[PDB]
Amino acid sequence: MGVQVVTLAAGDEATYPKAGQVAVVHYTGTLADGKVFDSSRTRGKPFRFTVGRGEVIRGWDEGVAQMSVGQRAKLVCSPDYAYGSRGHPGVIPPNATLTFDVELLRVE
């Protein structure tokens, strides 16, 4: 509830991030309509963070939490569990659902 994950490219399906551990994945902006947005891969630099900490949003937390290394899927979560609330002009809608494509690269 509030965050959904749709598998896109099956990966290892064996190695998953641990609660409190630092996981590295690639996030890509995308709207429910399909409109593509700014992505991290665009700069050839994956985003890493501690799954469970307060540095990321609830969406990514659960999303990546249920993700596997080398696995790619879409992360469609609500603004209540992300930064969609405030958002920005030409970047993020006013408290609107968002779908960020997350791709696990490795876990640490």
Identify the CA nearest to 16 among candidates 108, 81, 101, 99: 108
Please name every residue paired with 26 in a beta bridge, in sequence order, or none if there are none. 103
Domain map of the chain by residue range?
1-108
Structure determined by: NMR
Distances (CA, A) of 32 to 13, 76, 78, 89, 96: 26, 8, 11, 17, 10
**CATH number for the segment(s) 1-108:** 3.10.50.40
Residue 37 appears among annotated catalytic residues? yes
Per annotation, catalytic residue among 16, 57, 61, 92: 57
Per annotation, catalytic residue among 61, 92, 100, 101: 100
Residue 100 appears among annotated catalytic residues? yes
Interstrand relation of 72-77 and 3-9 (parallel, antiparallel or unpaired): antiparallel
Tokens representing 25 are: 């994945």
Residue 83 appears among annotated catalytic residues? yes
105 within 8 A of 23, measured Cβ to Cβ? no
Identify the H or E element spanning 5: strand 3-9
